[PDB]
Design an enzyme around this catalytic site. Sequence first.
Site, short mmCIF file in Angstrom:
data_model
loop_
_atom_site.label_atom_id
_atom_site.label_comp_id
_atom_site.label_asym_id
_atom_site.label_seq_id
_atom_site.Cartn_x
_atom_site.Cartn_y
_atom_site.Cartn_z
N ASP A 36 -7.80 1.35 34.57
CA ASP A 36 -6.60 0.95 33.83
C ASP A 36 -5.41 0.79 34.79
OD1 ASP A 36 -4.54 0.52 31.99
OD2 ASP A 36 -4.66 2.51 31.10
N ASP A 223 -2.47 -5.39 32.92
CA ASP A 223 -2.97 -4.09 32.47
C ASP A 223 -4.45 -4.19 32.11
OD1 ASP A 223 -3.66 -1.73 31.42
OD2 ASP A 223 -2.33 -1.82 29.70
#
Length: 333
Positions: A36, A223
């Site tokens: 992430d 992201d």
Amino acid sequence: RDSGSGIVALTNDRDTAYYGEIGIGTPPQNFAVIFDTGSSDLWVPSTKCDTSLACVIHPRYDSGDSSTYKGNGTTASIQYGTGAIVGFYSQDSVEVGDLVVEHQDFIETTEEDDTVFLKSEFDGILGLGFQEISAGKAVPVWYNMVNQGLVEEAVFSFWLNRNVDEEEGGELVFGGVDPNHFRGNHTYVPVTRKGYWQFEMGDVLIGDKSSGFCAGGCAAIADSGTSFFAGPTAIITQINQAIGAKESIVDCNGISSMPNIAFTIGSKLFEVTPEQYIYKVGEGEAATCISGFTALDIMSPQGPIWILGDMFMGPYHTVFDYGKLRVGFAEAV
Ligand SMILES: *[C@@H]1O[C@H](CO)[C@@H](O[C@@H]2O[C@H](CO)[C@@H](O[C@@H]3O[C@H](CO)[C@@H](O)[C@H](O[C@H]4O[C@H](CO[C@H]5O[C@H](CO)[C@@H](O)[C@H](O)[C@@H]5O)[C@@H](O)[C@H](O)[C@@H]4O[C@H]4O[C@H](CO)[C@@H](O)[C@H](O)[C@@H]4O)[C@@H]3O)[C@H](O)[C@H]2NC(C)=O)[C@H](O)[C@H]1NC(C)=O
Ligand SMILES: *[C@@H]1O[C@H](CO)[C@@H](O[C@@H]2O[C@H](CO)[C@@H](O[C@@H]3O[C@H](CO[C@H]4O[C@H](CO)[C@@H](O)[C@H](O)[C@@H]4O)[C@@H](O)[C@H](O)[C@@H]3O)[C@H](O)[C@H]2NC(C)=O)[C@H](O)[C@H]1NC(C)=O
């Protein structure tokens, strides 16, 4: 012997989340973890979490069985949607891509919001953002990698397979770029604020002309932990209309008639087609087509923020260049 390719094979769960295996402790304890770029901590379920179903149903880290474990105990709290995750810091060895990252601080979770994490195929999250946005300002995994000299290049990169029928879900490379998964050049933009993988973006086009709202210069984040696009209501509103939209946002059967959306990054148009930005939860004619453009208004000193998730990083191979503080996108293959 543990060295030194830096490759992580990624599993694709219905195009919604991508995860791979890491090992913690010696002897190693294996966890499925989302990689992430939006957060900066490493966290996994702890043997000390007995009140949350997610920790009980997922593999849990046990410090008593790791000979390299070094207690810390600093508590931490991370909000995930309405709920949160809570735990305390520990230190141990972490093996990602057959790189053994020594003395890594990570969170053992004490409580997890069961609404998000109960039915997850993954167990944890390995944060690849900057240190400023870590709960306890822990040194992130990637920084330790760089610091221990485990990578030849100060970049990491993602190939996310969008075809859920195929067997390769994707591939994450620490310390380089896989030339098999892009064509042409990357377009590089520098990092504007350091905590997030954040850069300056231009105007967002619906069909062939301007949304106006980002023509003066917006902010955006790559992201890898998010699937859907998120952006200011002022743009999402217009998109909803031009698409035919009505928790979520629905349509269907008119996908081919919809317009392409395009982001202007580095004075170039990165176009996303209806096929790529509509998610299809069904399969036949009782299927449900859902829009990937979700509204979210967050400010920054650089202007309102766009989140570009996996729906963008799928079609666009993405390089996170830490050594030059820049992000690059190329057409993926
Ligand atoms: C429980 O855990 C929490 C959460 O991690 C601890 O609180 C944080 O602890 C970290 C780590 O000490 C603090 O970050 C440091 O802050 C320093 C001041 O800004 C800064 O010098 C550090 O940056 C250097 O080091 C990193 C790599 O860190 C190595 O050393 C630490 C020592 O424990 C290990 O944790 C790491 O795994 C790794 O082994 C580099 O990336 C960075 O560029 C700097 O490198 C310089 O120094 C290195 C030698 O130290 C050298 O090798 C390099 O070449 C270069 O010269 C780092 O930012 C953080 O500030 C702190 N948080 C808060 C809020 O204070 C907590 O301490 C802990 N509690 C207990 C009881 O253990
Ligand atoms: C895709 O991206 C590539 C960039 O990664 C593009 O290729 C690059 O194009 C630029 C500009 O045309 C070149 O940069 C210039 O090169 C000269 C000459 O370099 C030579 O001399 C220096 C010493 O002065 C030496 O260090 C070099 O090794 C060379 O021997 C420089 O003097 C200029 O200041 C400027 O940097 C790149 O060389 C070139 N790179 C490559 C790998 O070709 C490519 O054109 C892009 N493709 C498309 C379709 O856009």
